[PDB]
Amino acid sequence: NLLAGDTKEQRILNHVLQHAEPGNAQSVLEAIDTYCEQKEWAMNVGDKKGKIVDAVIQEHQPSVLLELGAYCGYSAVRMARLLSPGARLITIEINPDCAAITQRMVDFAGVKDKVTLVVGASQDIIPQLKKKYDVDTLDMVFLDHWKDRYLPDTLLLEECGLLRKGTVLLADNVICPGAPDFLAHVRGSSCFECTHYQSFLEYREVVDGLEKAIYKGP
């Protein structure tokens, strides 16, 4: 059943419930992309940057993924749809209302079984990932939360022993608005090997970009 439609997020979800095929992840993604292109802008990674996220996953084939910043569940659906049987996505969202919409988005898209949604701040949840969430290390991290948190969380992930030789970090919005402290760290450190992907801001013609940084080991 539908939500009131009071917030943009409830309206994006209602649109999906009314205008997309249940259990069809592609259909769900197209509906969110269409709604935000035509009706109301929203901070989903979008279809053009979404294709870059697709290719990174398809190249490195992660089994254990971490996403920081869920929102309405667009990238969770996008990433989870490409995962092998037994692969897990952990997605961390601070806002309980978004987390509610994300769970519903994920259920509807048929990727429920792939996703562990955790309500809370990344800095409180990250130190718990091993003991509470049964994580050894991560194959891949998607960073798409507050941009001033990209660097402290990257270091925290390192300090907590969650990064290994070959962990792929992928960061949205390194051009728009930017995360220059994170970008200097990964590019400047011999612990990371970086690739830059120029693209466009979601639903706009503004230039944006993603950075891929593969961890070398400490």
Ligand X SMILES: C[S@@+](CC[C@H](N)C(=O)[O-])C[C@H]1O[C@@H](n2cnc3c(N)ncnc32)[C@H](O)[C@@H]1O
Ligand Y SMILES: O=c1c(O)cn(-c2cccc(-c3ccccc3)c2)cc1B(O)O
Give the residue numbers marked as catalytic.
144, 147, 172-173, 202
Q: Binding to ligand Y (CB under 6 A): which residues in 111-150?
A: 144-146
* Complex with ligand X: residue 120 or 166, whichever CB lies closer: 120
Residues 6+ apart with CB under 8 A from 120: 92, 93, 94
User: Closest distance between ligand X and the C-beta of residue 32, in Å?
Assistant: 8
User: Closest distance between ligand Y and the C-beta of residue 12, in Å?
Assistant: 15
Is residue 91 within a helix (H) or strand (E), and if so which, with residue range?
strand 88-93
User: Closest distance between ligand Y and the C-beta of residue 94, in Å?
Assistant: 11
| Residue 206 site contact among Mg ion, ligand Y, ligand X, none (CB < 5 to 8 Å, cut-off depends on kind) | ligand Y
Distances (CA, A) of 114 to 8, 48, 50, 79, 189: 26, 23, 18, 10, 33
What dihedral angle (degrees, nearest 10) is formed by the CA atoms of 151, 89, 173, 195? Answer: 80
Report which of 114, 181, 97 is spatially closest to residue 146, judged by C-alpha positions. Answer: 181
State the Cα–Cα distance between residues 63 and 6, nearest whole angstrom: 37
- Candidates 39, 41, 123, 195; binder of ligand Y (CB under 6 A) is 41
* Complex with ligand X: residue 8 or 185, whichever CB lies closer: 8
Which residues here bind ligand X, judged by CB under 6 A? Answer: 43-45, 68-71, 74-75, 92-95, 98, 121-122, 144-146, 149
